[PDB]
Ligand binder design. Structure first.
Ligand code: CLA
Ligand code: CLA
Ligand code: CLA
Ligand code: CLA
Ligand SMILES: CC(C)=CCC/C(C)=C/CC/C(C)=C\CC/C(C)=C/CC/C(C)=C/CC/C(C)=C\CC/C(C)=C/CC/C(C)=C\CC/C(C)=C/CC1=CC(=O)C(C)=C(C)C1=O
Ligand SMILES: CCCCCCCCCCCCCCCCCC(=O)OC[C@H](CO[C@@H]1O[C@H](CO)[C@H](O)[C@H](O)[C@H]1O)OC(=O)CCCCCCCCCCCCCCCCC
Ligand SMILES: CCCCCCCCCCCCCCCCCC(=O)OC[C@H](CO[C@@H]1O[C@H](CO)[C@H](O)[C@H](O)[C@H]1O)OC(=O)CCCCCCCCCCCCCCCCC
Ligand SMILES: CCCCCCCCCCCCCCCC(=O)OC[C@H](CO[C@@H]1O[C@H](CS(=O)(=O)O)[C@@H](O)[C@H](O)[C@H]1O)OC(=O)CCCCCCCCCCCCCCC
Ligand SMILES: CCCCCCCCCCCCCCCC(=O)OC[C@H](CO[C@@H]1O[C@H](CS(=O)(=O)O)[C@@H](O)[C@H](O)[C@H]1O)OC(=O)CCCCCCCCCCCCCCC
Ligand code: HEC
Ligand SMILES: CC1=C(/C=C/C(C)=C/C=C/C(C)=C/C=C/C=C(C)/C=C/C=C(C)/C=C/C2=C(C)CCCC2(C)C)C(C)(C)CCC1
Ligand code: OEX
Ligand SMILES: [Cl-]
Ligand SMILES: [Cl-]
Lengths: 36, 97, 334, 51, 137, 33, 244, 50, 30, 32
């Protein structure tokens, strides 16, 4: 059960950093008209 | 061969009088002087061989012996029905209003 | 040309057949987790002791259910609002008896549906649209939060969240009426107004545009072929539509501006469903529908029944029967 | 009392006791009628006729 | 039907004397009963002990009899159990216990009759509804 | 479960026959162009 | 030095019976002329075994083991009773009261859920004669009552019960009832069980004792519906004695 | 009542090469309460679907 | 056989989903 | 007669399925 707990914690943490860092990587600028 | 023991008990004295071996404690409210004190005592010291056995309960004050005598004709005793006394069902049988 | 930057471009690419985005990065895993677990549970879960009284309810197909009676059964009332992942159970067998799969499904679902709404904003920004379609979807999404999370919080248990099932849905809405008189609640009355009104305006708008198609086809072809995808001209005459509906009612109860008309279609069912979702959310804290039981009496003081009292009798028949074994004391206070 | 008459006086032949997906003949439900058992009479312990 | 003085005539004491309230006294008690008592006794039941109710026939069988103004006025001063054997001022509101039950503080003696009388009149109006419970709602 | 045995033939025909109809008309639509 | 509710809440330790130091190998002597009560009897199951049904005759099936699916809800505790000294020096414990039942459901290989009312209700357990001292070789043996798993008010899923509910299969109004008599009429069983309590630890200073137990009883019969299984329960126990 | 009496066709091909237990705790050999790990009858099926 | 029938229809809908999306007639402009 | 009840569904699909195959192929030949 503990191998599972660890795994789920790792999967979740990894997707949430994806998310957070992804929006920090210049999201306002990723549109079609005005980039900045 | 398969009987409902509770229905069958409705066709005894149980179905007409307060059964001192089986009836829920809330019944003793239908006659004056009997609830909560004497009633509590009757349920604790059950079962009884005869209706008159309750006059032998230790701790009775003569006033209490008076009230029971006054009411023995409202009492009966049938055999203990397990379904009716297990579960603490003589103190609370799930019936309210 | 750097690796994170290439990945970031694929994530937000407007060229993927289906758009991912940073919200999609959370939604896809959580919606597959909820979906895969739902499908297996619905088909093959053993029965679940929803009410915490060691009286398990069978919900899956292999255990005697059909499409109409099956459900993934809410988690056990012994758990209340406690978190119950797989890893908190001695074994999968325990997790299944106690209704573990429900918790898994609803949490992943609400998450990914929350990200689903975010994804509606995100892609709108990447195509240069106006942003507010996601506001519209928040009316249904709020409704799902209400029956799967909010109502369980104020009542104290995930066992009174909505079953994931067709008859379990009906069980949920019967019990809600006995306990909250939801029909007599104004916010449910507005949800009906929103949902009847929506269906009416859907038909009205669809019939009125359909009534004013400009002739572009012959009798032997679908008029639908009169429109070509991406044509610059409009495909119906709105002046003629205004001219008809204006006269069916009167001129000023009908729209001549398409923007007000389409915003009207958007707003009406959205608002009404905000309210009915708020109604469920607030009856979670037992602020119930109007009670006029015995509000009318005569000069002697007799009760003179109304239809509210009749409703109440039906409500009572629900109260006294629901979860028939689970109550030991005279009031059902949650 | 002719049996045919008593068989009318039975809710099983009432057409408004059916169900939409309960299929087939009425005989598939309550069975094939065979005989009238008689008219039943209830009395309490006092001897009142009861209905 | 209307609030006649018949229905407003209620026994005063067990001797058998009677007393006839005003409409205004009847409605006085109704008001005071919703203020002090109805949180537990709505409809003439008792939510925290459904076994005892305020039907006149249950009251007549209490010890001492409570089917009358004196017995009711006394019960609100010094409550006992159904058999009369233990004073229960500590757990039932009463003038004797207005320290711990603060709603009973500003009840004058006439307020007590109004309340007692409301209780004896309502069974005459509502029938089995009074003390019957949800079965009769 | 003690279920209706024509349920199965019923469901299969309910599904198959309208479906085959739609397919037959679709495939001959594609064979024109 | 003791623990508090907030140290325990959520641990699982609330379902565990108290333990005795592995030093405690003394003995607690009995004055035949004093009286004694058990203040706390605590019974903690560790193992659940269900007898299989061997289909043929000469096979007498075995006790197979099971999965518990109802969590840490299993232990009997706060049990008190008299501790008599009979004429020949045996001690007899008579249960009075306590939390002396726990519903339990265990799942066998294959899926079958077995519910059972784990209980020591109305327990009388005696020793051998001539005790004079409770020691790490003492055995109590005795028997108890196993009432019905459901009590009289339980309604089955179609509303059928014993002291409440319907007396018939109302969804099948003109079905021949003789088949369903067994499911329509509910029955309130009351069986007996048996228990051995082996003492293996004794604090003679304090009167605490602890050891192992084995009981054998019947599972739920669903108010007549089906036949019960046979259940063997093993675990550990702890009791404290007081001069009455 | 062994598998070959019950019309089981593929159950024996799993048994032939070592798959003998189910996640519900039985084995074709008769032993009750057994931990097969992933590669039970159930798990082999699963993997063929994936 | 009831179980089987229900799952087969559901399965088919999921496959129709698949073709309706990746094998749609592609919309084309003017 | 106590016949096999999957016989109906087996005969039915044995007829229907390959017949639909042929009809599908004939009609789309005729429309080109
Ligand atoms: C985007 C990915 C994602 C997200 C957001 C979640 C979110 C969740 N999962 Mg899920 N899960 C996922 C992917 C994800 N999962 C995948 C891909 C799998 C398959 C391997 C699973 C398998 C899985 C299981 C088996 C279970 C969950 C459970 C849960 C819940 C508890 C998580 C927890 O305690 O983490 C805690 C960790 C953090 C909060 C990290 C913080 C990091 C920052 C710095 C939550 C709803 C559990 C659940 O729902 O129980 C009801 C549960 O039993 N998940
Ligand atoms: C003749 C039949 C009839 C009528 C008039 C109504 C009317 C109504 N029902 Mg009712 N209902 C009906 C049949 C009917 N219902 C049936 C058959 C069912 C199923 C059994 C229900 C079930 C039902 C429920 C469950 C609820 C209602 C509700 C409502 C209200 C909202 C309806 C709404 O917004 O719809 C959409 C329609 C529109 C958006 C168009 C406008 C509608 C109004 C009525 C027109 C008013 C015109 C007005 C008088 C102005 C004229 C003068 C002007 C020139 C100045 C409204 C009072 C709700 C309610 O009780 O609210 C109290 C509610 O919760 N109905
Ligand atoms: C004519 C009678 C009538 C009418 C018109 C209504 C109308 C309504 N009722 Mg009432 N109701 C009635 C009688 C009636 N009711 C009666 C008699 C009772 C008592 C027995 C009730 C009890 C009752 C309750 C208890 C509730 C309602 C609710 C509602 C609303 C349901 C729609 C909704 O929530 O949408 C909102 C939209 C959604 C819920 C959709 C969420 C969808 C998510 C976002 C996506 C899901 C994705 C899906 C799983 C996958 C699809 C993908 C696909 C590719 C496969 C609506 C206003 C519900 C409500 O207000 O909920 C807030 C509610 O809980 N009603
Ligand atoms: C008016 C037409 C009619 C009527 C009233 C009857 C009446 C009867 N027939 Mg007969 N029958 C008919 C036409 C009719 N039949 C036809 C056309 C045939 C040839 C197919 C037969 C073949 C036939 C046989 C073989 C048998 C009967 C039998 C019976 C009896 C019981 C039938 C039963 O249980 O129904 C059950 C009815 C239903 C379950 C209702 C089905 C309605 C469906 C659900 C509608 C479909 C909805 C649709 C798809 C929704 C989508 C719409 C939207 C998308 C646009 C009854 C006396 C039986 C009997 O007892 O004989 C002795 C029997 O065995 N009938
Ligand atoms: C003894 C004697 C003799 C007694 C005297 C008795 C006597 C003789 C009496 C007789 C009286 C008499 C002779 C009759 C005259 C009396 C008369 C006035 C009767 C009143 C009748 C009456 C009550 C009528 C009903 C009133 C009523 C329901 C209408 C009010 C308006 C109404 C609700 C309209 C809905 C409007 C709505 C909300 C929005 C539009 C809907 C919608 C969004 C459509 C979409 C849409 C709209 C567009 O617009 C266009 C463009 C397009 C594209 C489009 O998508
Ligand atoms: C062209 C061929 C493809 C068509 C076949 C499509 C299948 C459609 C299936 C529909 C029938 C569903 C029957 C399932 C039940 C079945 O087993 O019953 C089979 C039942 C007979 O029922 C059988 O009878 C037996 C003794 O005869 C026993 O009782 C069996 O137990 C019982 O199953 O057959 C009929 O009812 C068939 C015809 C019914 C038509 C009359 C009702 C019409 C009512 C009007 C509805 C119109 C609504 C319009 C809506 C818009
Ligand atoms: C999809 C398209 C559908 C095609 C039409 C379907 C009909 C095809 C023919 C069906 C088989 C005929 C079976 C009759 C129905 C029957 O009762 O089946 C039903 C039987 C199953 O048997 C059922 O079993 C039940 C318990 O499981 C009960 O015992 C039932 O009584 C019994 O009917 O179906 C089969 O046995 C499965 C078919 C697979 C047989 C494969 C072995 C044969 C391989 C030999 C192939 C050689 C062919 C040579 C070619 C030259
Ligand atoms: C031992 C295990 C071995 C593992 C081996 C690795 C297997 C890889 C599996 C992943 C392959 C998937 C390819 C699909 C790509 C394709 O879409 O092409 C489409 C194109 C090319 O790519 C895209 O558009 C990217 C978009 C991806 C969209 C995600 C879809 C998931 C949505 C969630 C649905 C929820 C459930 C819905 C209910 C019906
Ligand atoms: C004593 C009480 C005191 C008062 C009470 C206080 C409460 C009031 C709260 C409401 C405030 C109202 C502001 C609304 C104005 C507005 O929306 O304008 C926006 C547009 C502009 O109109 C359009 O106006 C345009 C010009 S412009 O935008 O105004 O510049 C023009 O181009 C166009 O032709 C014309 O049609 O209005 C319309 O499009 C009509 C649609 C009306 C939508 C209302 C939502 C209804 C939801 C009800 C839910 C029911 C569910 C059950
Ligand atoms: C709940 C907090 C109560 C409030 C407020 C009031 N009463 Fe009450 N009442 C309550 C209980 C639990 C009981 C039973 C006590 C017992 O064990 O005997 C009662 C009883 C009565 C009775 C006696 C009824 C009988 O059949 O003998 C009466 C007359 C009564 N209560 C009256 C009464 C009045 C007038 C109140 C407001 C002033 C009032 N009660 C408050 C619980 C509660
Ligand atoms: C053989 C057999 C049998 C039968 C069977 C059958 C009848 C079959 C069926 C089958 C089927 C009938 C299948 C199906 C399949 C399907 C699929 C495989 C699907 C797919 C899909 C997809 C892939 C999707 C995708 C997606 C994405 C990706 C994204 C989003 C969208 C979507 C969702 C679309 C039996 C059991 C009797 C017995 C044994 C043997
Ligand atoms: O669980 Mn579901 O349902 Ca809401 O109230 Mn109380 O709890 Mn139960 O009762 Mn009524
Ligand atoms: Cl319910
Ligand atoms: Cl309760």
């Amino acid at each position: 059960m503990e191998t599972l707990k660890i795994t789920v914690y790792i999967v979740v943490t990894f997707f949430v950093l994806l998310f957070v860092f992804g929006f920090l990587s210049g999201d306002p600028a990723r549109n079609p008209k005005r980039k900045d | 061969e398969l009987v409902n023991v509770v229905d069958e008990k409705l066709g005894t004295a149980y179905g007409e009088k307060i059964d001192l071996n089986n009836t829920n404690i809330a019944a003793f409210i239908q006659y004056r002087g009997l609830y909560p004190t004497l009633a509590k005592l009757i349920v604790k010291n059950a079962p009884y061989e005869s209706v008159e056995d309750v006059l032998n309960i230790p701790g009775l004050t003569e006033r209490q012996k008076q009230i029971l005598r006054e009411n023995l004709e409202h009492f009966t005793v049938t055999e203990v029905e397990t379904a009716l006394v297990e579960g603490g069902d003589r103190y609370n049988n799930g019936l309210y209003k | 040309a750097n690796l994170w930057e290439r990945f970031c471009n694929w994530v937000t690419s407007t060229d993927n057949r289906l758009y991912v985005g940073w919200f999609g990065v959370i939604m896809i895993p959580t919606l597959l987790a909820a979906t895969i677990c739902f499908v297996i549970a619905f088909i093959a879960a053993p029965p679940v002791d929803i009410d915490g009284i060691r009286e398990p309810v069978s919900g899956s197909l292999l255990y005697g259910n059909n499409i109409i009676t099956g459900a993934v059964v809410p988690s056990s009332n012994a758990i209340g609002l406690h978190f119950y992942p797989i890893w908190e159970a001695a074994s999968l067998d325990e997790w299944l008896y106690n209704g573990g799969p429900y918790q898994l499904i609803i949490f992943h679902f609400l998450l990914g549906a929350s990200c689903y709404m975010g994804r509606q904003w995100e892609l709108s920004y990447r195509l240069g649209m106006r942003p507010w379609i996601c506001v519209a979807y928040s009316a249904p999404l709020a409704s799902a939060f209400a029956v799967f999370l909010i109502y369980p919080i104020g009542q104290g248990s995930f066992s009174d969240g909505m079953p994931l099932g067709i008859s379990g849905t009906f069980n949920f809405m019967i019990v809600f009426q006995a306990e909250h008189n939801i029909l007599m609640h104004p916010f449910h009355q507005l949800g009906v107004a929103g949902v009847f009104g929506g269906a009416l305006f859907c038909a009205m708008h669809g019939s009125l545009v359909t009534s004013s198609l400009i002739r572009e086809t012959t009798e032997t072809e679908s008029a639908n072929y009169g429109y070509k995808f991406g044509q610059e001209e409009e495909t119906y005459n709105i002046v003629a539509a205004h001219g008809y509906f204006g006269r069916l009612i009167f001129q000023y109860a009908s729209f001549n501006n398409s923007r007000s008309l389409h915003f009207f279609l958007a707003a009406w069912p959205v608002v009404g469903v905000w309210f009915t979702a708020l109604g469920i959310s607030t009856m979670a804290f037992n602020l119930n529908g109007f009670n006029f039981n015995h509000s009318v009496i005569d000069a002697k003081g007799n009760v003179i029944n109304t239809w509210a009292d009749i409703i109440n009798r039906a409500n009572l028949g629900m109260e006294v029967m629901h979860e028939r074994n689970a109550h030991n004391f005279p009031l059902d206070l949650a | 009392i002719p049996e045919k008459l008593a068989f009318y006086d039975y809710i099983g032949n009432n057409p408004a006791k059916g169900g939409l997906f309960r299929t087939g003949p009425m005989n598939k439900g309550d069975g094939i009628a065979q005989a009238w058992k008689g008219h039943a009479v209830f009395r309490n312990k006092e001897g009142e006729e009861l209905f | 039907a209307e609030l006649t003085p018949e229905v407003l005539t209620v026994p005063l004491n067990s001797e058998g004397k009677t007393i006839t309230l005003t409409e205004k006294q009847y409605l006085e008690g109704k008001r005071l009963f919703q203020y002090a008592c109805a949180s537990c006794h709505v409809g003439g039941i008792t939510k925290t002990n459904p076994s005892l109710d305020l039907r006149t026939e249950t009251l007549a069988l209490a010890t001492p009899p409570r089917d009358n103004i004196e017995g009711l006025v006394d019960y609100m001063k010094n409550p006992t159990t159904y058999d009369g054997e233990q004073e229960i001022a500590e757990v039932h509101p009463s003038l004797r216990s207005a320290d711990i039950f603060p709603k009973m503080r500003n009840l004058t003696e006439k307020d007590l009759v109004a309340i007692a009388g409301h209780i004896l009149v309502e069974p005459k109006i509502l029938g089995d509804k009074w003390g019957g419970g949800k079965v009769y709602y | 479960m003690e279920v209706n045995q024509l349920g199965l033939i019923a469901t299969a025909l309910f599904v198959l026959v309208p479906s085959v109809f739609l397919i037959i008309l679709y495939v001959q639509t594609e064979s024109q162009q | 030095q003791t623990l508090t509710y907030d140290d325990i809440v959520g641990t699982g330790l609330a379902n565990k019976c108290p333990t005795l130091d592995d030093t405690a190998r003394g003995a607690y002597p009995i004055d035949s002329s004093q009286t004694y009560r058990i203040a706390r009897l605590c019974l903690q199951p560790t193992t659940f075994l269900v007898k299989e049904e061997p289909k043929n005759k000469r096979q007498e099936a075995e006790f197979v083991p099971t999965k518990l699916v109802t969590r840490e809800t299993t232990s009997l505790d706060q049990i008190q009773g008299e501790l008599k000294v009979n004429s020949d020096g045996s001690l007899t414990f008579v249960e009075e009261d306590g939390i002396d039942f726990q519903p339990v459901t265990v799942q066998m290989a294959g899926g079958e859920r077995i519910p059972l009312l784990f209980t020591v209700k109305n327990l009388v357990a005696s020793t051998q004669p001539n005790v004079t001292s409770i020691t790490t070789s003492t055995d109590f043996k005795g028997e108890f009552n196993v009432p019905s798993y459901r009590t009289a008010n339980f309604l089955d899923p179609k509303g059928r019960g014993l002291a409440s509910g319907y007396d018939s299969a109302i969804a099948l109004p003109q079905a021949k009832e003789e088949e369903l008599a067994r499911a329509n009429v509910k029955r309130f069983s009351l069986t007996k069980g048996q228990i051995s309590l082996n003492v293996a630890k004794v604090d003679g200073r304090t009167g605490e004792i602890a050891g192992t137990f084995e009981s054998e009883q019947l599972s739920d019969d669903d108010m007549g519906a089906h036949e019960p299984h046979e259940v063997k329960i093993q675990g550990v126990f702890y009791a404290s004695i007081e001069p009455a | 009542n062994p598998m070959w009496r019950q019309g089981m066709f593929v159950l024996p091909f799993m048994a032939r090469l070592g798959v003998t237990g189910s996640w519900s705790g039985w084995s074709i050999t008769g032993e009750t309460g057994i931990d097969p790990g992933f590669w039970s009858f159930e798990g082999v099926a699963l993997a063929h679907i994936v | 056989m009831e179980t089987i029938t229900y799952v087969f229809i559901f399965a088919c809908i999921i496959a129709l989903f698949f073709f309706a999306i990746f094998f749609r007639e592609p919309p084309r402009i003017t």
